[PDB]
Design a protein around this nucleic acid. Sequence first.
RNA 1: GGCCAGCAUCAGUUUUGGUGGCAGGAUAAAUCCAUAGGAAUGUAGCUUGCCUCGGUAAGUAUUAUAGCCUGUG
RNA 2: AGAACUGGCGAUGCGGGAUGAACCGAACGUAGAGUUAAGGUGCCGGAAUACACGCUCAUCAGACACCACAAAAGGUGUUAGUUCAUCUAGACAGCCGGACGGUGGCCAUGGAAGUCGGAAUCCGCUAAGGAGUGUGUAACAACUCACCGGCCGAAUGAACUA
RNA 3: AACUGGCUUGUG
RNA 4: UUUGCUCCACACAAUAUAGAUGGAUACGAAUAAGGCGUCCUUGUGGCGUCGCUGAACCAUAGCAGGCUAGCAACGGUGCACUUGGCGGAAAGGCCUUGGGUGCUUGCUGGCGAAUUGCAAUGUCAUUUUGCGUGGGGAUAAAUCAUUUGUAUACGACUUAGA
Lengths: 197, 36, 171, 234, 191, 137
Amino acid sequence: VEPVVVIDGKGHLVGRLASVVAKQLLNGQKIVVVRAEELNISGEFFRNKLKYHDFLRKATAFNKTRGPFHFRAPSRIFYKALRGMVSHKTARGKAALERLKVFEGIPPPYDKKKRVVVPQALRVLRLKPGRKYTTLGKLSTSVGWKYEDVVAKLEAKRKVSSAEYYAKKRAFTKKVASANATAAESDVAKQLAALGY
Amino acid sequence: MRVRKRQSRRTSTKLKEGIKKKASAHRKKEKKMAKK
Amino acid sequence: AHFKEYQVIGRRLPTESVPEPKLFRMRIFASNEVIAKSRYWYFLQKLHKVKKASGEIVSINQINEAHPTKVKNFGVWVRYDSRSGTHNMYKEIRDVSRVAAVETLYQDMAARHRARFRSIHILKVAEIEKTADVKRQYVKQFLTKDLKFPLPHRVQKSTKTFSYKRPSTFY
Amino acid sequence: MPRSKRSKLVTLAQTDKKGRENKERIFDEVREALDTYRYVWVLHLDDVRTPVLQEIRTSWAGSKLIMGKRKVLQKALGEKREEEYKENLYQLSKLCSGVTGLLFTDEDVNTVKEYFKSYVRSDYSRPNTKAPLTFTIPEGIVYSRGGQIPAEEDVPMIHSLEPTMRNKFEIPTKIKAGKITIDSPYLVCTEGEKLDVRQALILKQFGIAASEFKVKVSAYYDNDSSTVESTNIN
Amino acid sequence: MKYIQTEQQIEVPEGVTVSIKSRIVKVVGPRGTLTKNLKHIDVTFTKVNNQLIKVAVHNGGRKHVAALRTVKSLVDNMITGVTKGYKYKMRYVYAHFPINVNIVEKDGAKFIEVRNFLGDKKIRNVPVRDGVTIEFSTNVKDEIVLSGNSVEDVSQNAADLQQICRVRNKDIRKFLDGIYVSHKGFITEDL
Amino acid sequence: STDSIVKASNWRLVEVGRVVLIKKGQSAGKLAAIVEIIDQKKVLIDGPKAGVPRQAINLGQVVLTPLTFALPRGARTATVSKKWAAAAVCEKWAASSWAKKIAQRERRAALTDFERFQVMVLRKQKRYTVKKALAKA
RNA sequence: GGCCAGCAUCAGUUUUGGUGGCAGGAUAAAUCCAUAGGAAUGUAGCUUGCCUCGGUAAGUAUUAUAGCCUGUG
RNA sequence: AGAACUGGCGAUGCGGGAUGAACCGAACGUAGAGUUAAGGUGCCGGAAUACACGCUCAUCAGACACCACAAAAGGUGUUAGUUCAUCUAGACAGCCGGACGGUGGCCAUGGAAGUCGGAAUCCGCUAAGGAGUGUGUAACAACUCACCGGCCGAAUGAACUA
RNA sequence: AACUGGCUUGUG
RNA sequence: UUUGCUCCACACAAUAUAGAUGGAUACGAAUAAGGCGUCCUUGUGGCGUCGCUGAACCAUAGCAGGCUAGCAACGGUGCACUUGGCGGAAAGGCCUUGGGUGCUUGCUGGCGAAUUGCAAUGUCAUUUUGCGUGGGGAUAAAUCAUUUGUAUACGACUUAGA
């Protein structure tokens, strides 16, 4: 629908997001993902950390270099699980994953562009309350992604910038709504409502 | 920590068919006993 | 499947010098006729010395309910042979009809006991007119005056994969 | 709450529980008492001693003094006018509010109403009460009496009880050799204040029955008159 | 058994005021204020009027409702900690070696400094949390008093403090010395 | 000023009296009212006026409206119709902004291409007016 | 007069929708109309308390200033 | 282990079982269209992130073919049951009081007072209070239950199964 | 030249 | 440079497109909560209102978009300039000033289209490159050989050399 989709990854879950993404890629929508320090995974911190140390101890015992890379960072985690969801060895796969771009935080140029969500992956719908979740920023900094305090600063910069922006947009909508409702009660408006607008 | 080795949950077929043959032995023994 | 309640009688065959035996009746729950019949013969072979070949069926009649939409408290005495020796049980439902109550029962027994339709027995349905002789509590709390409660955390089931809105439940 | 419950402590003690058999037993027994005896006295006794009650009973065997649970005593007396063993009993079933306690006599009224004014004992504070004395504990060795008697003949308090003094009684109690000592004097209470439970306990620990004990009564009934009498004497 | 609605009452007195947006609380009274986040707990609050507030849960599992009773008692502890204020009293006892105990301020740090412990040379500092004040006991030997509004801060600080003198490798029955709590009262005295 | 300012936590509540919309089933865009509650997730309803039967239903198939009127449990359909027309909900609902939106989507789906070109031009005219209205003031 | 295709009508095969007329069951059961009786998670009304002076509390009250349940038709 | 019968494989491919001698389905000429079996439907992967009742939240669950081997049980995790007990004539939790006299019962001992310890199991008043659970001092004392009773008023508890 | 069939482990 | 490199204009050529064919239309935090507006004592304030799908908002007629006439308005939009700001996370864009230049379907007129023959993607977008056309721009380093030796298996590495 949109040529370039820009997901916000906050409030979301990995697997469910990953599945919907992978299918959208294999059908071709160029998809981009942000804020993936603030993803969520089910379960508790310690279960997820035990898991990841297990993946971390997996290594090629004859030469440790050439085997399973324990990518620490969040975006590349998400990429990992997605690479499991895809046939990454073949060309349909590779020309899927060249339709994917993962970032942390939000760089430009997408902050000036629209962000979306997924319904059917979100924590806040999908999880029963009284049940734990795990911020990937906390997790990955616990396991050796040494950039977390940076991105919070930059996102804090972005947030005020967007704040001033929304103030402008709001005032503009205020004026425009007043203008349109004052222009309403014209017969053309009556006819529009007659036709359902 | 040092997160230690797991047992799998993988199928490992010899144990499946060993289970089936063991099961039939168990049920045979049950029928040999069940007259009493 | 989706269930019905049936009325059956069997009239075990006329033998000479005992014609017309005593028309043993049952009320039997199932989704259709022949399943109902087979269960009549199954209970009957348990309860006294019959076989199907030595017996014959009088009639099948769907029992509709008299006043369906009357909310009713039902209480059901049942048996089941789980893996152990057989054993009894009572359960209590606030519901609309006998048939729907036993529907919910069959599924709940399936959850909580891994209990099959085949190895369930119903003894009996009863309906309770007056309150406050229901033994259980989880129905009993649904009987109080001026009752109100919420649907918290309501979630809306969209067809689309995207939403552009940062949704919410309400509240 | 099928699991994650408390475990209640199981023992092998000798005494067993009474149940309703003793309840209905005493009910019918007072109803037996009613027509037999003639003079009836309702007794509010909040602080009670087992030897005092036995002393009163072995004083008056021709009387009978009965105590038991309240609502069944109200039952056996009859709480309504509609239900009662005899008449004019519901109204005096109303008033009997406190720890009661009851007597069945056939003797004079005068002798008993002067008896229980003459009858006075020494008991403890039993708080939500006054105790007619104050106590400062001196900044020295502490003793079983707490400064009552001379310091030569009082015995110092045992070194077992001191952590109870630190925990319950809120008091700094510091332990030199085997006796027990304090560093500042401790006043426990004053006159004219309602004694607290820790205050009552410390005077108990000293073992001081500084409070007077006298029973009051509120009322009297006679069967042959079949009439109720109201008397607040203490 | 999946209780449908559970609920408890908390009693606001006349003096004190409370402001509850979503699951945040502020509680203000004469001694001062406190705040607390409770976003992890998933309940509902309601006023009826101004001396009583109702907490509640709908569709409770056992864990959910046990949490309900807990959160009530937490907020009541805050209320007490404003209107009364809480007050915890300790003593620091020695057989041979007198403690030197002191208060210091390192850049505004409010450390608590102990020396001569068991004939040591070691300095041990303990921080003080915000919102709690110290006093060494005037006219009472070998005693220290803490007072505050945050009960959790107070108890955590003193529990730390007796957790510092956990004397190690040595027979506890002999080394009776240490720093311990005398009692847990309120500030007031009268009420 | 020295009073406690928690806010009411406005719920929509299920109770005897709650009037309800249906999103899936046969009626599937019609109203009714509860009479009775069965459990947390099933309720027994009936609305005669729109046409819908009496029935049990599961709650996830329905959504609540803020609207309510007083009503007694165990009701019969004559009783609820009488109370309904006394309480005047159909006007209230249809005046509510939600039903305006439902009607809007309905009509737009019911709409002809010729009328689509009409709305195009009339929207352009309104736009002309309004964009003059702005950039001046 | 070769190559690729398209439209219509027809046939075999087949998938998917609309719609009408019929039969059956307890000649559906129910709703709905009337009627009789009953009772409460007790509606009006009555009594007492508070009083924020109308909402509780406990009694009363079987339709009344709501209604429900059952039986028959 | 031995016999007897029967079916599969052997000469035989195909779909599924992640892969496969033994499993599940299935009558092989080439092609088209349709419908299905066994198995499955989050993504790999064609198919419902379908509907719906319940239970589960594991500090390496389970997704198992199942009775089957560790195995009978432990577990203050959790839901539902069974059988018994209690009760506004006041259940359970609790807070308060009593919780006695003969009696410090007999030897036993330096000391043994309900509790270092052997054996006895009384009556008295009793609402109830044992020849006496547990802390205890050298003994004694003091405190606690088990037992009743006062305030509260509401349902609760033992055992067992699943 | 190294688990028939989860083999082996602390308790006659 | 037999004018070689480069910035920019238009003519043609190839050259392909993991696949445009109205718009990637901007807050954040929470969801047992919030947003939007308004008022006040400006706060976790009050008051009203909204969601319950983007099934929307914007844009949108003219030969794949012409030639023309006006009417109403001085508003909108495009092009190339030009003033002044803002943004570093991969900024590579977003504002904004001025006028010039068109068009304006806000409304009413007039002309044309045909014949692609009942439809055939009926081609209109972007990446890359070269030849030419004509206005600008600027005038290198590396390597081999030699030599060194802090390095050196030969390569490599590190030094000096008009």
